[model samples]
Target: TLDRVGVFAATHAAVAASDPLQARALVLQLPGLNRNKDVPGIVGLLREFLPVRGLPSGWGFVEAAAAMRDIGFFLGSLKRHGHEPAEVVPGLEPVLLDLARATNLPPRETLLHVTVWNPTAADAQRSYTGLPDEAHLLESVRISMAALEAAIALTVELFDVSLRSPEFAQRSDELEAYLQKMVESIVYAYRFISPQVFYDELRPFYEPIRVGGQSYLGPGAVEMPLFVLEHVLWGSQSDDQTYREFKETYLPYVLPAYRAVYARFSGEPALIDRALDEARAVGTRDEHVRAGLTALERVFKVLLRFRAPHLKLAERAYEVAPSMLGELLTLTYAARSRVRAAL
Candidate 1:
C-alpha cells in the first residue's frame, strides 16, 4: 500500500533543490557496493564468463582501480576544469587525511575503515580463483549491458538529453545500443584481469527517475561516467567488436555529459564556465590544460556529492530515503536477475 507514494520525488520540490551532480553521483556509486550480499558472487559470475582470466587474485582491485580511476578522472576533470576546492575527489589520502584529523572517522579503525571500502579495494578480490561453472558469456553480456544502459541513461540525465521528446523517440534503440556499446567495450578489462570493483553501491542510495508512470532507467542508471570510464580502459578484446565501438561512440559522450553535470551543480555555472574558458585560454599551453583540468575536477567532485546521498537510507532504513534505496535494491535485484537469465 505504501509502495506507491514517492518520497525522493520531493527532493526536487524546487528548481534549486534538484541537483544533477548529486543525482549522478548517487546513481553511479550505489551498484558498486553490495553491503547486502557477497561481492564474491559477482566475481564468480565474472570468472564464469571469462574462464581464462589472468591475474584473478588482483582482479577486484583491477576493477576497483578502473572504477576509481573514472571517479578520479571525473573529479580530476572537474578540478582541471577549475573547481575552487581541491578536495573534490574521495579515496585520495590527503583528502581523507583532513577528515581523519577532524575526527570524522573512528580513530581505532582509522587505517582500517578510512575507506568505506578497503582491503578488498586495495588488493582487489581473487573471488574468480575457483569460480563455479555457472560463469558464462551471457553473464558477461548481462553485466556489460547493465553497465552500458546505465551509462547511456546517465548521459541523458547529466546532459539533459530528452529521449521522451517527440523528436528523439526513435532514438531509444540507438541510445540503448550506444549505452551497451559503451559498457561492453571495457567490461572485459573490468571483470577478467581486474579484481576490485569500483562500484560505490551507495551513491545511488537514492532513487531512480520516474519518467511517465514508473522508474524508467532503474537504479544502475545512477553510475554513468563511472561505468563508462571503467568500460573505457580496455584494449582490443579477444572476443567480439564490443571494445572498439565503445571507444568511438561511448567515450565521446563522457566529457560533454560531465560538463553538463558540472554546469547544473555548484549553482555557479559561471565558475565552471570560467574554468572551461581558462582551459581554452591555456589548454594549448599544456600547463594551461593541466591547471584548467585540476580546477574543474575539484568543483565537479564536491558539487557532485550533493546531487543525492540517498545513503541517508542506511541511517533511515524504512524511512523516506531508505524506501528509495529499498526500491532501488529491488529494481537492481530484478535487473541483475534478468542479466543472469540472459546469461
Candidate 2:
C-alpha cells in the first residue's frame, strides 16, 4: 500500500523524470495543501511529500535532520528547475526556522544529512538528478564515513598514550593502518562516479542556499569529517590562515562529538608536534621511539596520497582555476615534509 508520502514520492519522481515544467507546477500546489498556515501544518505537508525512513521513531534530531534534507531536495530541485521554493510556497522561511529548532541543527541539509542519515534503499534515497550515479556518489560517501569512524576511534585512543609509553608505537602503527584503510576506501569508492555526469547532472543540487538571512553550504564531499583526523594528526597547531578558516567554516557540519574533539585539540600540540618534541628529546637513539615516529610519518604520507587524486578530481570536474583544495594540498604536503624532516 502506498502511504501519503509514498504517493507524493512516486508522483514527484514521475514528474521529475518527465518535465521540469510539470515538476514546478506540482510544487506550486503545496501552498494550497498547507491551508492552516502554521508551522506544524507546513511540516506535515513537507513530511507528506518529502518523507524519509530509517530514522529513529520519535521526532528528534535525527528525524528533524532528515526532514531538513528533504526540504533541501525540494528547494534545490525547484532552483534547479528555475523556480524559487519560497516564492512558490509562501512562508517557507519561517517553517524552515521552526524545523531547524526541532532538529537543533543548521537550517539546511549537511554532509551528515546526505551521507549518514541518508537511506540506502533505492526508493528512499533523496536526489536531485534521480540518477543511479547520484546513488553511487552517496554510497561512496557512506563508505568513507564508515572508515572515518574507525579511524577516529583509534585517534582518540592515541591522544592519551604518550610517545614515551611502550604502547605508543603499537598504537601509532594501528592508527596508520586505519588511516590507510580510510584512504583506500575513499579512493576506491570515487571510481564509480563519472566526473562529467556528477558535474553536469548533480552538482547543481549542492549549490549554497540562503535561509534565514544566512547562506548554508550544501552537502558537498568537502564537508566530510576528514579534517577532524587532520586536526588530531597535524592541523590543530597549524597557523595557516586558509586551512584554519576552512576548518572553522565546515566545523558546524560535523557531529557534536567531532566538534568536541576539535575543541579539545585546538591550540594544543598536534600529534606531529608532540612526536617531534619526543624525537628531539631522545635524538632518535631509541628504536621504539624511531618506530613510532616512522609510523606517524606513514600516516601523513597516506594523507598526502589521498590529497593528490582528490585535487585531480576537483580540477577535472570543476574546470575552474586552482581551488581551495589545491591550496590545501600545498599545506598538506608541507605537513608531510615536516614529519619526514623530524625523522
Candidate 3:
C-alpha cells in the first residue's frame, strides 16, 4: 500500500489525514554540513550538516529559471503512460500538491517532479516495489538513500559557488539574468559532450528522481529505468544543434539579470557558507547511506520524495542554486575521477 502510492505520494496524500506516514521519522538530524567537503562529501555528511544556501535559500534566481526552462518531463510523462506497460507516471500535479502540504511548503511552484531519466538498470521490475521481498527491499532502500545524498550534495555546492562567485558574492544586487546565463552555459556544455559520454559508456549509471510520488522502482512501482525515461524525460536533439538553441535562447539576457541582483549579497563568504552548511544537512544518515534512496525520501517529507522542478520556491530561493551548481560540477568531477583512478 505504501509503496504502491510511491513513498512520497502516499505520505503526501496521507498528510491531510490525522496520520502522516512518519516522514520526519526517517530524518537523521545531524550537524548540517561543514565547510571542508565540496559537493559530494558535503552531501555525504548531511546527516550532520545543512548548507546555508540550499534549495530553500537558493529560490530567488532558480525559480526564475524554472519559469523559463522548457519542460523535459511533462511530455515524457504523458507518453510514458501509453508506452510503458509496467509503470506510468501519472499527472504530476496531485503528487506535487500532496508533497507541498506535507513538507510545510507554501504554494509557489506549479510544476513538480524531476524528469525520469535512465535509472540504474540494477532493478527492472515492471511495477512499484512496495513492501518488498527481502532481496529487493534493501536495494529499494539503497536507491532512496543515494538519491537524497545527491540532493544534499548538490545543495552544498550551490552555496560554495555563490559565496565565492565574484558576480554574485561581491555584487548581489544583480544575479537574476547572470544566473540564467550560467545555467544556459551549463546546459550548453552538456549538449556538446554529454551525448558522447552516454554513447561511449557501456552501461553508465544514472540517478533519476520522479516527482509526484513513486520512483520507477519503489515498492508498488514497476522498474523500467530506460523506458520510464524515454517515456517521460528523454528528448531528441543533436549535440551541436541543441547547443546552438541553448546558447541563443539563454545567453543574451541572463548576464544582465544576474547583474541586477548581484550587489545584494555583499560577498560575505562566512555568512554565505554558514547558510549553505546549515541547509545542506537534511539528506544524510544510516537510512540512506546504508539503506537506499527511495526509502530515505520516505523518511523525510513527501516533498523530499517528489523531485520539485523548482526547488527554490521560497524567498530563501537564493540559498539553493549556487551551491547546487558547485555540487553539480563536483559530482561530475568525482565521477570522472573514479573512472580515471580506475584506469
Candidate 4:
C-alpha cells in the first residue's frame, strides 16, 4: 500500500531532512550492499535514476541514500578483495563520496543505531492515520524482545565476519568502526532504556566469572573482572600487535577496571594488593603486554579499595583506546542457539 509506504517514507524523509547526522548513521544500518545478501529487497529501479547532487530529499531519496552506501561499501570490499581496476572505478566515485559524508560526521553516537532495539515499536509502527489495534502492547513486547535477541545475534555475526575479513590483521579500521558502533549502541541503549536485556542475555559475555565452577563468589574465588582480564591477557594471541594494542589500552583501561574493583567484595587484601601492583606496573612496562592479564586484574580493585572517596578525579582519569578485538569477548545469541541445538 502506497499509503503505508508513504508513512514510512515520510518519516524517514523528515529524519533525513531535519537530522542529517542520524540520517547518515541510518544508512549504515541498512544491509545488503556486500556481494553477499547484505541488505534484502525493496526497490528494483536503475542506479542511474538515483539522485547524484545535494543531500537527498524524500523517503524516496532516503531509501536511495541508504542504498548508495551499501552498494558503495560492497564495491569497496570487492575492489579490496579481488576486483579489477576498471570494474571498480565507476563504483568508487559515489562510494567515496558517501564514505566522505560518513567520515565528516562527528565520531561519537554516529556508528549504527538500527542495531539496538528500543521498546517503543508498537505505537511507532502504526500508520499516521490508522487507529491503534488491540494487539498493540502485547505484540510490541514480543517484537521488541525479538529485536533485542537479534541485536545479540548481530554482535556475534560482526565478530565472526570481522575475523573473516582479509584486512583483519592490523588495518581493519572500517571493521573496527563497525564494532565500535555496535558496542556504543548496545551500551547507550542498555544504560537508559533497558538494562534488563543486557543483564539477562549479555552479562555472561560482558562480565563472565564463576567460582566453584557453578556458583560461588568471594575474594578467594575468581571474579568477573579477573576472568575477563585473564581472557584479555592470556586467552589472546600476544604475538599479534593489534591484539596487544587492544589489551594494553582498551580492555585494561576502560571496562575491566570496574569489575576489578567489584571483585574485592569476594575477599582479598593480599590478592588485591598484588593485583594493583601489577596493574600499575603493566601500564608503565612494555613487558606486561607479553605477560598474562591475571596480574593486571587486581590493580583497579586495589585503587577502588584504598583510593576511596578521598581520591581526586584527576587521579582516576583514564584513556579509552578504540578496539575491534574486544568483540572476541562476546557470545552471540545465534551462537547460543547453535549451542542449544547441539545440546
lDDT of model 1, residue 343: 16
State the TM-score for model 3: 0.19
TM-score of each: 0.22, 0.80, 0.19, 0.24
Candidate that would win on lDDT: 2
**lDDT digits (tens) for residues 260-313 of candidate 1:** 443344223322233344345544346434433443243233222322232431
Best model number under TM-score: 2
Q: Judged by lDDT relative to the true structure, which candidate is superior, 3 or 4?
A: 4
- Give the deviation of candidate 3 from the true structure as CA RMSD: 22.2
List per-candidate RMSD values in Å: 22.8, 9.3, 22.2, 21.1
Candidate 3 lDDT tens digits, 1-343: 1122244333322212221112121111111211121233322332222222233333343332231111222222222223321123233334333333433331112112111111212332111111123123223333343233233223223334432233322222222212222233223333332323222220111123344453221111112121111111111111334322432332222223222222222233322234233324433242322222222122222222121222222112233243432332333343334323322
Which ten contiguous residues of candidate 4 have the minimum total lDDT? 215-224
Off by over 4 Å in 4: 1-49, 54-92, 104-239, 242-275, 278-343
Question: Model 2, residue 113: what's the lDDT?
Answer: 65
Distance (Å) between predicted and true CA of 202, model 2?
Answer: 0.8
**Per-candidate clashes, comma-separated:** 54, 0, 102, 11
